[PDB]
Design a protein around this nucleic acid. Structure first.
Ligand SMILES: [Mg+2]
Ligand SMILES: [Mg+2]
Ligand SMILES: [Mg+2]
Ligand SMILES: [Mg+2]
Ligand SMILES: [Mg+2]
Ligand SMILES: [Mg+2]
Ligand SMILES: [Mg+2]
Ligand SMILES: [Mg+2]
Ligand SMILES: [Mg+2]
Ligand SMILES: [Mg+2]
Ligand SMILES: [Mg+2]
Ligand SMILES: [Mg+2]
Ligand SMILES: [Mg+2]
Ligand SMILES: [Mg+2]
Ligand SMILES: [Mg+2]
Ligand SMILES: [Mg+2]
Ligand SMILES: [Mg+2]
Ligand SMILES: [Mg+2]
Ligand SMILES: [Mg+2]
Ligand SMILES: [Mg+2]
Ligand SMILES: [Mg+2]
Ligand SMILES: [Mg+2]
Ligand SMILES: [Mg+2]
Ligand SMILES: [Mg+2]
Ligand SMILES: [Mg+2]
Ligand SMILES: [Mg+2]
Ligand SMILES: [Mg+2]
Ligand SMILES: [Mg+2]
Ligand SMILES: [Mg+2]
Ligand SMILES: [Mg+2]
Ligand SMILES: [Mg+2]
Ligand SMILES: [Mg+2]
Ligand SMILES: [Mg+2]
Ligand SMILES: [Mg+2]
Ligand SMILES: [Mg+2]
Ligand SMILES: [Mg+2]
Ligand SMILES: [Mg+2]
Ligand SMILES: [Mg+2]
Ligand SMILES: [Mg+2]
Ligand SMILES: [Mg+2]
Ligand SMILES: [Mg+2]
Ligand SMILES: [Mg+2]
Ligand SMILES: [Mg+2]
Ligand SMILES: [Mg+2]
Ligand SMILES: [Mg+2]
Ligand SMILES: [Mg+2]
Ligand SMILES: [Mg+2]
Ligand SMILES: [Mg+2]
Ligand SMILES: [Zn+2]
Lengths: 135, 53, 97
RNA sequence: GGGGGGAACCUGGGGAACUGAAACAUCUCAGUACCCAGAGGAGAGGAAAGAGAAAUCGACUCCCUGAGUAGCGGCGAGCGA
RNA sequence: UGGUGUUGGCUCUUGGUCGCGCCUGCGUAGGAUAGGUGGGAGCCUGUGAACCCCCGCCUCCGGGUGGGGGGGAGGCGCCGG
RNA sequence: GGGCCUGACUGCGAGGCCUGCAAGCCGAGCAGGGGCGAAAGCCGGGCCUAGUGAACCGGUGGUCCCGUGUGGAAGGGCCAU
């Protein structure tokens, strides 16, 4: 709960739902450190965690990539989620909203299971708060 | 029939339709009945499998 | 239980239909009627006492039209009602319908 | 101004059973008989929040037809637009 | 006899579940109170360390966490058993 | 008794037996796709005569025939059980 963690607490409306072409203009003022920062995108799924066929296996990435075409991995847990890199702290805007736009539609391409596959998709930096957005 | 001598259908394993109805003793024949038979849809002989009636 | 003084709702004659079986929608053979007899359906009559022009007026009204009474009371603000007996007061209220 | 009367007719409020189903209960008889209230020389109804397939008709009533058709129905007896 | 209408005021103890936060999770090798998977070589401090004063507490009795009064520069992880 | 096998076939069926009706019974032969046999051929359950239940209502699988202005959908028809 750091000096920079709560100095992003008035750079964030945690009670506001954003769009994708507006949540890349608000992850550069949330990512300011002495080293580089992986702005992490996360998401809640909608399948049965003990049904062996309803798993999420695969890779992406593109158009752009990682940062250090950077095929980023993304896999689920034993209670349903994702947790995947990256689109770090610039990596310019509208090329960060363009690298954050062809990855949300990646995992939705690996579905007849039960429950809407689109829940909560939060985009947070290495050292910042969480933006609700729209997947 | 009886409780132990049941009625059953034979389903064409290719087009999954039921073409035949027959009986078996499930103490004598616990396994699913498997038989080749003429499917009127497929117009050829096809292994047919016992499915519940 | 009789008739509503506002709406005029009277008891109606209705059937009690006794049924048996599983509806066809639920995969059953269907409903069999094991008895039809006549009963009545009464209005939800209640007592409504209201003070109008110092007199205590009471209506026998169906609960459905309870507010309609209070409406009538408000409509009685511009009426020469003073001095009148409760009976003729109610007549004036009723005549506002 | 009302009250009461009028053979039958009419509308409204209520409303059977025998019987038929070759037993009976849903169904039938039948919204009939009957009781009640009201109307009049008639009464009801009546100017589309309608029909229903005609891209159509055009208030209501009454007769002919549509038709024992469409349907309803312990899909029975029968009922019937 | 349940629900509901007629049928209202106040208070207390409450509960379903919706979100959110702060937390609770100890079979066995073991620094030692390991929820599930993951990102990540920096993080936490003039938004005040390390040891103390009252601790809201829980705790498989070893421990886990939080506030302020003392309180002025470390801790926590990399590494890797 | 033993090999291979699923004809305990699909689509029909001349002709009869029996017979108040409705049923019940036997059936050569043609086509489809098969089994067995070198072949003639045989195979539409069981040496035979009992081991059963008309319609009505409804379930399941097909079919994709009807679909209440039109596209659907509800519902139903047909084949099978
Ligand atoms: Mg058969
Ligand atoms: Mg057998
Ligand atoms: Mg066919
Ligand atoms: Mg009832
Ligand atoms: Mg019925
Ligand atoms: Mg009252
Ligand atoms: Mg109400
Ligand atoms: Mg008169
Ligand atoms: Mg009448
Ligand atoms: Mg009458
Ligand atoms: Mg009586
Ligand atoms: Mg009777
Ligand atoms: Mg009789
Ligand atoms: Mg008789
Ligand atoms: Mg008798
Ligand atoms: Mg009748
Ligand atoms: Mg008279
Ligand atoms: Mg008169
Ligand atoms: Mg009139
Ligand atoms: Mg008009
Ligand atoms: Mg005209
Ligand atoms: Mg009738
Ligand atoms: Mg009660
Ligand atoms: Mg109540
Ligand atoms: Mg032999
Ligand atoms: Mg043998
Ligand atoms: Mg043999
Ligand atoms: Mg062979
Ligand atoms: Mg065959
Ligand atoms: Mg013949
Ligand atoms: Mg005959
Ligand atoms: Mg027979
Ligand atoms: Mg042949
Ligand atoms: Mg041959
Ligand atoms: Mg051969
Ligand atoms: Mg041959
Ligand atoms: Mg033959
Ligand atoms: Mg027989
Ligand atoms: Mg019957
Ligand atoms: Mg049927
Ligand atoms: Mg069609
Ligand atoms: Mg056909
Ligand atoms: Mg239609
Ligand atoms: Mg069509
Ligand atoms: Mg329609
Ligand atoms: Mg359409
Ligand atoms: Mg159907
Ligand atoms: Mg259908
Ligand atoms: Zn087939």
């Amino acid at each position: 709960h750091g000096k920079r963690y709560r100095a992003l607490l008035e750079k964030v409306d945690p009670n506001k739902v954003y769009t994708i072409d507006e949540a890349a203009r608000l992850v550069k003022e949330l990512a300011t450190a002495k080293f580089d920062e992986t702005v992490e995108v996360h998401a809640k799924l909608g399948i049965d965690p003990r049904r062996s066929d309803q798993n999420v296996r695969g890779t992406v990435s593109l158009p752009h990539g990682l940062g250090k075409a950077g095929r980023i991995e993304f896999r689920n847990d034993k209670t349903g989620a994702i947790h995947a890199p990256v689109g770090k702290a610039s990596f310019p805007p509208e090329k960060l909203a363009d690298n954050i736009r062809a990855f949300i539609r990646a995992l939705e391409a690996h579905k007849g299971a039960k429950g809407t596959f689109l829940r909560s998709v939060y985009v947070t930096t290495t050292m910042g708060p969480s933006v609700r957005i729209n997947p | 029939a009886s409780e132990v001598r049941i009625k059953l259908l034979l389903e064409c394993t290719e087009c999954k339709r039921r073409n035949y109805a027959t009986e078996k003793n499930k103490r004598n024949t616990p396994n699913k009945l498997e038989l080749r038979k003429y499917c009127p849809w497929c117009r050829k002989h096809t292994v047919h499998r016992e499915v519940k009636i | 239980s009789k008739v509503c003084e506002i709406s005029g709702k009277r008891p109606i004659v209705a059937n009690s239909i006794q049924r048996r079986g599983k509806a066809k929608r639920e995969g059953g053979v269907g409903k069999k009627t094991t008895g039809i007899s006549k009963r009545r359906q009464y209005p939800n009559l209640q007592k409504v006492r209201v003070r109008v022009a110092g007199q205590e007026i009471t209506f026998r009204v169906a609960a459905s039209h309870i507010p309609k009474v209070y409406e009538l009371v408000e409509r009685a603000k511009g009426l020469k009602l003073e001095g009148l007996s409760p009976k003729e007061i109610k007549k004036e209220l009723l005549k506002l319908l």
